[PDB]
């Protein structure tokens, strides 16, 4: 009974897990690991106030 099911694996995205919002389009949360994003990319995207991320499906569109 997830509130934020991961856009890839459908398991809950918890606040204590590395995860990112697809602000580009679909607005689903995705576990970092599910996306194949490295820890460094994750930290970089976090630090970039002006950057947003899109999931592979949304970016393909």
């Amino acid at each position: 009974m997830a509130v934020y099911p991961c856009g890839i694996c459908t398991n809950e995205v918890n606040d204590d897990q590395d995860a990112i919002l697809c602000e580009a389009s679909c607005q689903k949360w995705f576990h970092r690991i599910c996306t194949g994003m490295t820890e460094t990319a994750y930290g970089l995207l976090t630090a970039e106030a002006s950057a947003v991320w899109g999931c592979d499906t949304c970016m393909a569109d």
Partner: peptide, 7 residues
């Protein structure tokens, strides 16, 4: 970008 690491 908005993540769980965001302050």
């Amino acid at each position: 970008a908005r993540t769980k690491q965001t302050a």
